[PDB]
Amino acid sequence: KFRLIPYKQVDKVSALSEVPMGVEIVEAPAVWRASAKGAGQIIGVIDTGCQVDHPDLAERIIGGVNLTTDYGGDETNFSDNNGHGTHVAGTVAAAETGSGVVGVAPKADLFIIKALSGDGSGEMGWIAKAIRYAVDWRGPKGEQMRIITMSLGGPTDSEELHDAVKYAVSNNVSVVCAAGNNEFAYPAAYNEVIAVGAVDFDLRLEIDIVAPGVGIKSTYLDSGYAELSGTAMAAPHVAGALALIINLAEDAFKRSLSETEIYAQLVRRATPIGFTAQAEGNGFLTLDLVERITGQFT
C-alpha cells in the first residue's frame, strides 16, 4: 500500500476567520495582485477526496474523479471520508469569503482526485492512474492541470508509477510530493518530482524546497477546520505557489514555460535558511524573492 505520510492531529474546530500563518509567511499576498491569485491554473489534488460543499472550497472546485473502491466505486463521488484531502485543498485554494480560511492560490481551481480510501491508504495502481488522468484531463473550455500535488508515500520503486511521473513531466505538469518522514520513499524520491520538506513558523526543522508544516490550519470535514502538523502539510503550500508562479513567470517571459523552466522559477523563489541542502533543499519558499533582489547589485 501507498499511504498518507503520517502527521499529527492538533485541532478540529467549527469556525475560523483568518489567513493562515503559512499562507502569509510564504509571501503569497505580496504576489497575489501580479499573479491574479492563481486564476487560470488548476491543481490536481491526489488524496482522499474533498468536502465539495465546504464554504471555503465549493466555488474553487471544478471537477474531480474517484479512482478508489470507496462508495462503489462511483467515479463521480470524490467526497472526503478521511479529512486529509479537504485539508490539502484548503491550503492550496480556499477562497477569500470574508471568513474561514484562505489559500495560497485563492483564485485557482481544484480538480479533486481520490486515489486514497478513508483509511488514507491506496493501491499503487490508483496513484499511477491519478497521475495519468490529471495529465489527460481537459475542462469543458480547454482548461488543464499544470500542477499535481500529493502527500502520500510508498516503500516501492514501481516502474508503472515512475512512468506516470516521467509522463507528467514530459507533458509539463509539475509533480509535487511531500517528503517521506524508507517506507514512504516513492514517488517523492524520484528525480523528476518536486519533493517538499517542512519547517515550523520559526523556520525550524532528497528535497527541493521546504515550506511550513507545523500547526497548519485549514479546512476540514463538516464544513469545519483542523490544525495539522507534519511534512505532508508543506507540499500543498508549494502546489499553491506554483499556480501563482506559473501565472507570473509566463506573464513576465511573455511565453509558455516548460516543466523545467517552471521548476527553476520555483527554486529561485526559495531563500536558504542556513540549514544543510539535505535538510532544506534550495531553501524556504519566499514568493516575493525575485522582486526583493531586482535591482540589487554590488
Binding site for Na ion (CB under 5 A): 56, 97, 100
> Looking at beta carbons only, is 69 or 191 nearer to a copy of itself?
191
CB of residue 107 vs Na ion: minimum separation in angstroms? 12
Residue 51: CA count within 13 A, CB half-sphere: 21
**Cα–Cα nearest to 99, from 22, 18, 21:** 18
In angstroms, what is the minimal distance from the CB of 226 to Na ion?
15
Among 84, 212, 267, 285, binds a copy of itself (CB under 8 A): 267
Q: Is 182 in the site for a copy of itself (CB under 8 A)?
A: no
> Where does the chain break, by residue before each gap (C–N > 2.5 Å)?
181, 205
Q: What does 154 interact with, of Na ion, a copy of itself, none (CB < 5 to 8 A by kind)?
A: none
Indicate whether 271 belongs to the interface with a copy of itself (CB under 8 A): yes
DSSP 8-state code for residue 156: -
Maximum pairwise Cα distance, the chain: 64
Does the footprint of a copy of itself cover residue 274 (CB under 8 A)?
Answer: yes
- C-alpha to C-alpha distance for 244 and 32, rounded to whole angstroms: 7
CA 296/CA 189 separation, integer angstroms: 36
Pick out residues in 27-86 that bind a copy of itself (CB under 8 A).
27
Smallest separation (angstroms) from a copy of itself to the CB of 184: 18
Using CB under 8 A as the binding rule, whether residue 13 contacts a copy of itself is answered as no
Q: One symbol per residue from 189 to 228: x for binding a copy of itself (CB under 8 A), - otherwise; what is it?
A: --xx----------x--x----------------------
Burial class (CB in 10 A: 0-12, 13-18, 19+), 298: exposed
Distances (CA, A) of 131 to 30, 37, 162, 228: 31, 25, 10, 25
282 binds, among a copy of itself, Na ion, none (CB under 5 to 8 A by kind): a copy of itself
Distance of alpha carbon 68 from alpha carbon 227, whole angstroms: 26
Q: Give me the residues that bind a copy of itself (CB under 8 A), please.
A: 27, 191-192, 203, 206, 249, 252-255, 258, 260-261, 263-268, 270-274, 276-278, 281-283, 286, 289-290, 293-298
